[PDB]
Design a protein around this ligand. Structure first.
Ligand SMILES: CCCCCCCCCCCCCCCCCC(=O)OC[C@H](COP(=O)([O-])OCC(O)COP(=O)([O-])OC[C@@H](COC(=O)CCCCCCCCCCCCCCCCC)OC(=O)CCCCCCCCCCCCCCCCC)OC(=O)CCCCCCCCCCCCCCCCC
Ligand SMILES: CCCCCCCCCCCCCCCC(=O)OC[C@H](COP(=O)(O)OCCN)OC(=O)CCCCCCCCCCCCCCC
Ligand SMILES: CCCCCCCCCCCCCCCC(=O)OC[C@H](COP(=O)(O)OCCN)OC(=O)CCCCCCCCCCCCCCC
Ligand SMILES: CCCCCCCCCCCCCCCC(=O)OC[C@H](COP(=O)(O)OCCN)OC(=O)CCCCCCCCCCCCCCC
Ligand code: HEM
Ligand SMILES: COc1c(O)c(C)c(C/C=C(\C)CC/C=C(\C)CC/C=C(/C)CC/C=C(\C)CC/C=C(\C)CCC=C(C)C)c(O)c1OC
Lengths: 24, 352, 431, 126, 55, 352, 126
């Protein structure tokens, strides 16, 4: 497992809608 | 003060003044580099930056390189901003101020930084050692102020008046119309600098071959080799240098560089070997020198050498048009040697 | 001296320039690191290396022509330089030893030797370089789970797990004719315009490139590799730039060039500059700048890379750079904008018009694939003088103000505060 | 705080005029005599304060000998004032040897500082 | 150099409230100590406003 | 293992064990010095200090020097408290612990400081590099650990077990009765050491002449000169060294030193010139080598040399006595050279 | 604070005898397994107080390949205790892997320090 392989955050990552409204 | 230029449809341009001086002509060893780092600042006419930051504000940058015999000053600008840059460059090339209290803080820390970052790499040290041991106190000299002698501002000014002069000068810029420069130097202070004498050399510099040196650097080992080349037969060493450095011959995956530094009337064929260990280097250089001394046919690289030489040129001051047709063979004769890093394992000159 | 483009099966472009006399002809494939999956990373690297070794040995020995290459994210710029009077031979070699046949090239012995050489090269790059490493890490952390974060070199685990079949499969899924062009930068006029289209001189594998399911995204992150063994420090901020083919490329480039580069150990750089450089120079804070705003066909990156020497004073360097970026988006002097315009003009002039034909050929290939037509620098100069303070204000109000950042550095970063001391201070609470 | 550019301008204007010079030179001489610092062993090129960074740049430009001599004079003055005495009438600083050695190293740096503070606020021009 | 760490009256407060590298694994008891400090300060304030009207 | 001593009536005495090893026999470069610094600490039987401070409480001192080929361990004590000191010295000479974990902090700083002091003086560096050029990587080796090669704790242990052997050892003393040592080396740990091999070289060390080196060290210049001297004719160089270093001859108000370093069979005649400047050295050394080649009669210094040689001797392990009688004349021949400091000013070997 | 020399003495005395060993070693393993650090990732060569000077020397003496592993273990432990979870029952420390590597580097240093601190209060000797 090389360092570039970012661990799976999919459990905690926000859904596929970016965050351009979450700042609000 | 003969000038030359070339016209270009492209709308970016740069002008260069090629002072025919540098390390070779320095009376004291560590003055050429310090002068060059002392060059673009604090004119008597206009301030060091209060009237040179306006160059960047106006769309162009300044650069003053160094070499073995060229104190080159360059400036890249747009097409419509030429006369101001010619005037500023002539003003800096006017031995203007050389203020005394602007050396202990301005350039010396820069000189120390430059020396420190240029001495870590053993390649540069090998080049310097090879030049010094091959040319003595003639062409060769320490390219960098290492502080071995105290050099005084009087000596800097003396060197500047020795080299910066109208007769021993040359100006060339690209993408600039010829008439503008031909009539703009005369409308500038470059018509007023005293006429010194051309510091060129009539005959070849005296060379010394056979001797070797060594040091005890802490790091990767390097085993430089050098040859002296004269102007009469300089094509063969260039074609051989490119033959070695390329992937055409098997001696490619171990050598580091095989450049051929060019002077007015001669040069030093160099090459390098370097590795992390201190045992592979010995065997590698042993087989390299054995095979070179064996004598290799060299013609089937002429086209590659011609292409690399042509693509190498970017300056208007084209070097002499070498004749790449009278190359038929090669057999190594007598050479030189420098060893850097560890010495206890590197081979001596006798058994090489 | 005008670039010509067309569309006859395979796109052929030409930037004639009888100034230089080093003719170059090659291909610019519109795929690379971005067009390939994480599990098989260094396939492009291996292609480039097998070429650059064995084909070099072939060409120099036979004829006179030195072949180069480049891969950045989605190029395989297999430019083959030559003499002005030797372009037909270069094209014949390129079409006889790159597209086909690949049997005389992919011998197991040559492939294995190149594989071990690539392993050694990537290893010592990992152990020696540093700014490039942190830049690659910045890409890999900005685009997690996206076919753009994977580096242009690869990982040893991904490098070792591929022999022949994967290489050939990628060749047949990306070396097509739909997204492959020919570039003839140098001093050729129309011989390349007609000789590329010949009885058989054409790339194999007709079809189309397999379209990626997802293109690109962004999210704030950190990848720090804190190790006190290394002497200096390394950091690289980042804010999502503007993709190519957008009415924001040049305004972003100017917004990056305002602050500009800086080398603290040069007599000709400390004296000049703008506010942050002076306020740093009063003490000793930093040792290098690089304001870079890189852009790609999917998304671009506006970055800020340094490699300092002081270790206790990281926080102050970051705080000052952030306050200066806020100053950029709140209020800019007209003279600053004018100076930036002039500097960026000269920088573009140097970059696009460097004497080396290979750089021009690669950039022309990039633009012709992405833009669809070359943008001659005359129009760039015409449209660059129109950039005005209001436009930059508007652009920075979008890309910069309170937008997620990504940083990634290797070295003695430990002094750097983690996230809320480098993110929630891009507005300084008084705009 | 008050720059020596303005002081130098006022001084040159006063000195150039002959009648005003004849009016103000004697009072200046008598003032500096009654100033009460020649006797205790001070040159006027030291009394100027050392808080402004321009002063730091000025001192950093001095040669070795003058800095050493200045150090000796200032410490001796410290001690003599501590004693409450004055120096003997043999080492009183004579009038003809109150040379300005430090003024040029103030003006040379003051000009650069002024043009630095000015050139930042330049305009786009035409 | 950042004004937070330069002025003395603020260089003091920086090292105690603005930059003090507490350990990673803190639980609520040290937060409870901070609670105690604030309880002390509100006690002092209300005591002043108490003695303002106390014989 | 032969013990030799002489009795004296004085109330202080010295016992020294002279291991026939050092920088000449080191397999790696920076190992011999570090071992010598590694010697008196952390025995397995008695502690590193807790049972060697009580040596001071008893009234004796400990020293462990290093030289070209002698790892001398000296202990000076009163007349009576001998058996404890022979016990402790033999226990140290038993490769007892050589603790790997207590070497990165014990002897590395000491070795670094010693190297710094040694390299500060250009005369010592000139001597070292003269040995290196004349004797190659046989006899010639660096005397101090400069970190050029990575030396391993296992390698230190291997060298210790290579040299700390019974056969290749000598014990001497004076102001101690022969009857004490002659038996005290038997009921002691020293009599159980393994019998290694005679590391003594049989034939003369291979000497190389003519080659010269140069370094660009900062500081006052110095210009060493050397001559390889064998056992066949070693009297002449000793008498000439004393003739130059005395005040008998005019070539004496300028030479810094002229010491001869004595070996088992070889040795290297040396003579050094140093000065503050970088120009007086040139003329001085030119005149020295100019008139030394002429040939000077040397007989009227034999008596002074005899006195100096006699007063030099202090130990039972005295250097082999020499017959100062067949010393008639002298004439220099091929030699070896080193220049340190500024290098451009100091003359090259060709014109010397 | 309580030196490891005394611990070593008591441990050897307890473990050497057969009956006390048979009565005491069965409960020690259960005690360790019930303790807690085993699952959260701590090796006992880390949990000790590591601030007093003799432990400081011991830490200074450790080879690299164990110091790095100790750093990883302690930071991961900090994280897991921060998140209030426990490590999954696949990356715990096995029973046979809790080997003491740091003990000798404490015993040797402690012996040296104890037997040097006593050496100053020496007597006339007889
Ligand atoms: C406890 C401490 C908590 C605050 C520390 C903090 O946030 O530090 C981060 C930040 C670190 O400082 P920095 O990063 O060096 O500052 C860069 C920005 O320019 C910082 O922004 P700035 O330069 O605008 O800071 C000055 C001023 C600070 O406000 C003032 O207190 C001045 C009025 O900023 C404001 O927040 C002013 C607008 C808000 C007024 C609200 C009035 C409420 C009554 O400091 C603050 O934000 C300080 C806020 C102070 C507010 C009062 C604190 C009372 C403490 C008791
Ligand atoms: C009436 C009384 C109130 C007056 C309020 C004046 C508002 C401006 C204050 C100075 C800001 C400034 O000076 O901003 C103009 C310059 C412009 O820098 P730049 O944009 O060219 O940097 C190029 C990239 N933008 O910023 C600076 O030099 C910043 C210098 C450091 C910041 C110090 C701020 C301390 C005072 C803050 C006061 C806040 C209230
Ligand atoms: C030790 C003292 C413990 C008790 C102190 C409690 C009061 C201080 C809190 C300051 C928090 C702060 O000032 O916060 C500042 C943050 C800034 O955001 P930032 O820090 O990321 O910007 C940093 C880089 N730009 O904005 C907020 O939080 C906004 C919310 C503020 C809520 C205030 C609530 C007041 C409660 C008072 C309780 C009684 C006292
Ligand atoms: C006063 C009105 C607000 C001024 C804002 C300002 O002056 O803010 C700019 C200053 C400095 O700017 P800087 O921290 O970026 O250092 C870059 C320039 N050297 O910072 C601060 O004041 C930090 C906040 C401290 C607040 C002090 C008063 C509150 C005490 C409680
Ligand atoms: C933490 C510190 C303090 C504690 C724990 C404390 C506690 C108390 C307590 C228990 C009482 C009894 C009141 C009751 O019976 O209802 C009291 C009374 C009082 N305290 Fe304090 N006190 C503190 C500090 C102060 C200070 C600083 C002041 C004044 C500035 C102050 C002023 C008073 C006064 C005036 C009373 C009056 C009694 C009352 O009216 O009941 N106290 N305090
Ligand atoms: C170790 O890490 C830290 C840490 O470093 C710090 C600083 C704190 C913070 C510490 C504190 C908040 C405690 C500090 C408290 C004091 C110093 C108490 C100060 C004492 C006082 C008496 C305050 C003085 C104020 C008054 C007397 C106000 C009265 C004035 C009035 C009423 C004005 C009246 C005028 C009119 C016109 C009505 C921590 O909590 C902490 O742990 C996380």
């Amino acid at each position: 497992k090389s360092t570039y392989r970012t661990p799976n955050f999919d459990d905690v990552l926000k859904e596929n809608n970016d965050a351009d409204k979450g700042r609000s | 003060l003969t000038v030359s230029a070339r016209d270009a449809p492209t709308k970016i341009s740069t002008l260069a003044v090629k002072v025919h001086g540098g390390s070779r002509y320095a009376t004291k060893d560590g003055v050429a580099h310090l002068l060059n780092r002392f060059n673009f600042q604090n004119t008597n006419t206009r301030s060091a930056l209060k009237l040179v930051r306006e160059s960047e504000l106006l769309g162009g940058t300044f650069k003053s390189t160094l070499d073995r015999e060229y104190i080159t000053l360059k400036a890249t600008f747009l097409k419509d901003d030429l006369p101001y840059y010619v005037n500023a460059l002539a003003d800096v090339l006017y031995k203007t101020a050389f203020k005394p209290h602007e050396l202990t803080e301005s350039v010396l820390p820069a000189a120390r930084y430059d020396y420190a970052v240029a001495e870590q790499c053993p390649v540069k040290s090998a080049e310097d050692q090879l030049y010094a041991i091959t040319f003595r106190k003639g062409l060769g000299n320490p390219l960098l102020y290492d502080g071995v002698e105290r050099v005084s501002l009087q000596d800097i000014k003396d060197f500047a008046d020795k080299v910066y002069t109208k007769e021993n000068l040359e100006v060339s810029g690209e993408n600039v119309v010829e008439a503008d420069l031909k009539r703009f130097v005369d409308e500038s202070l470059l018509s007023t600098l005293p006429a010194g004498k051309s510091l060129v050399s009539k005959s070849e510099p005296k060379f010394f071959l056979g001797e070797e040196n060594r040091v005890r650097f802490i790091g990767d080992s390097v085993a430089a080799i050098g040859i002296p080349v004269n102007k009469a037969s300089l094509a063969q060493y260039e074609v051989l240098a490119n033959y070695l450095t390329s992937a055409l011959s098997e001696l490619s995956g171990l050598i580091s560089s095989a450049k051929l530094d060019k002077f007015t009337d001669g040069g030093l064929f160099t090459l390098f070997v370097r590795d992390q260990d201190s045992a592979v280097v010995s065997s590698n250089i042993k087989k390299i020198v054995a095979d070179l001394k064996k004598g290799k046919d060299l013609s089937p690289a002429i086209n590659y050498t011609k292409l690399k030489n042509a693509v190498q040129n970017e300056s208007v001051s084209s070097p002499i048009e070498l004749n790449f047709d009278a190359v038929k063979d090669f057999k190594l004769g007598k050479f030189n040697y420098v060893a850097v890093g560890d010495v206890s394992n590197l081979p001596y000159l006798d058994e090489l | 001296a005008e670039v010509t483009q067309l569309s006859n099966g395979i796109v052929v472009a030409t930037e004639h320039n009888p100034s230089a006399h080093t003719a170059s002809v090659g291909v610019v494939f519109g795929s690379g690191a971005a067009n390939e999956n994480p599990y098989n990373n260094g396939v492009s690297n291996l292609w480039k290396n097998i070429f650059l070794s064995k084909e070099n040995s072939a060409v120099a020995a036979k004829e006179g022509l030195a072949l180069s290459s480049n891969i950045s994210r989605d190029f395989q710029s297999y430019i083959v330089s030559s003499l002005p009077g030797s372009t037909d031979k270069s094209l014949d070699f390129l079409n006889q030893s790159f597209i086909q046949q690949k049997a005389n090239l992919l011998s197991s012995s040559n492939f294995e030797a190149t594989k071990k050489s690539v392993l050694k090269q990537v290893q010592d790059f990992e152990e020696n370089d540093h700014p490039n490493r942190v830049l690659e890490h910045l890409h890999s952390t900005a685009f997690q789970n996206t076919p753009l974060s994977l580096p242009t070199r690869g990982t040893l685990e991904s490098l070792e797990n591929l022999v022949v079949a994967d290489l050939e499969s990628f060749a047949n899924n990306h070396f097509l004719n739909s997204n492959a062009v020919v570039v003839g930068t140098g001093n050729i006029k129309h011989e390349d315009l007609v000789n590329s289209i010949e009885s058989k001189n054409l790339s194999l594998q007709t079809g189309t490139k397999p379209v990626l399911k997802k293109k690109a995204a962004f999210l704030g992150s950190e990848v720090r590799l804190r190790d006190d063994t290394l002497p200096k420090a390394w950091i690289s901020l980042a804010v999502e730039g503007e993709p190519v083919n957008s009415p924001n490329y040049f305004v972003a480039k100017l917004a990056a060039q305002i602050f500009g580069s800086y080398n603290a150990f040069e007599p000709a750089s400390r004296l000049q500059g703008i506010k942050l450089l002076d306020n740093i120079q009063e003490y000793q804070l930093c040792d290098n700048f690089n304001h870079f705003s890189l852009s790609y066909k999917d998304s671009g990156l506006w970055g800020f890379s340094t490699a300092t020497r002081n270790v206790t004073m990281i926080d102050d360097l970051i705080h000052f750079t952030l306050k200066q970026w806020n100053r950029l988006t709140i209020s800019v002097t007209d003279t600053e904008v004018e100076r930036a315009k002039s500097l960026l003009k000269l920088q573009l002039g140097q970059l696009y018009e460097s004497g080396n034909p290979v750089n021009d050929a690669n950039l022309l290939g990039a633009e012709v694939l992405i833009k669809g037509s070359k943008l001659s620098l005359g129009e760039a100069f015409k449209k660059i003088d129109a950039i005005t303070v209001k436009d930059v204000k508007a652009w920075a109000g979008k890309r910069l103000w309170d937008q997620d950042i990504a940083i990634a550095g290797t070295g003695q970063i430990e002094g750097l505060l983690d996230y809320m001391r480098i993110r929630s201070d891009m507005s300084m609470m008084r705009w | 705080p008050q720059s020596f550019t303005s002081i130098a301008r006022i001084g040159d204007y006063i000195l150039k005029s002959p009648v005003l010079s004849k009016l103000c030179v004697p009072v200046a001489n008598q003032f500096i005599n009654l100033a009460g610092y020649k006797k205790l062993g001070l040159k006027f090129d030291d009394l100027i304060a050392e808080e402004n960074p321009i002063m730091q740049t000025a001192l950093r430009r001095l040669p070795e000998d003058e800095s050493y001599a200045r150090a000796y004079r200032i410490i001796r003055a410290h001690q003599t004032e501590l004693t409450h005495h004055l120096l003997p009438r043999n080492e009183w600083i004579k009038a003809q040897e109150d040379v300005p050695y430090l003024l040029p190293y103030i003006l040379e740096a003051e000009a650069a500082a002024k043009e630095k503070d000015e050139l930042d606020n330049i305009e786009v021009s035409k | 150099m950042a004004f937070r760490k330069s002025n003395v009256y603020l260089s003091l407060v920086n090292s105690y409230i603005i930059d003090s590298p507490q350990p990673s694994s803190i639980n609520y008891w040290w937060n409870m100590g901070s609670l105690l400090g604030l309880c002390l300060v509100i006690q002092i304030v209300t005591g002043i406003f108490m003695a303002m009207h106390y014989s």
